[PDB]
Ligand binder design. Structure first.
Ligand SMILES: [Zn+2]
Length: 50
């Protein structure tokens, strides 16, 4: 297929900070019974099925 722009992502100047541990509920489900207080991080990436 067509392809031009080589992704408008930030330079390698510095690698972004990585999480310590993602939750199990908010991870996929999206919601968590602990809310923001939850000790685990809640990062919504957006996986695919299939
Ligand atoms: Zn959680």
């Amino acid at each position: 297929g067509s392809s031009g722009s080589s992704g408008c992502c930030l330079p390698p100047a510095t690698h972004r900070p990585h999480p310590t541990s993602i939750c199990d509920n908010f991870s996929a489900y999206g919601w968590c019974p602990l809310g923001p207080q939850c000790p685990q991080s809640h990062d919504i990436s957006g996986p695919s099925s299939g």
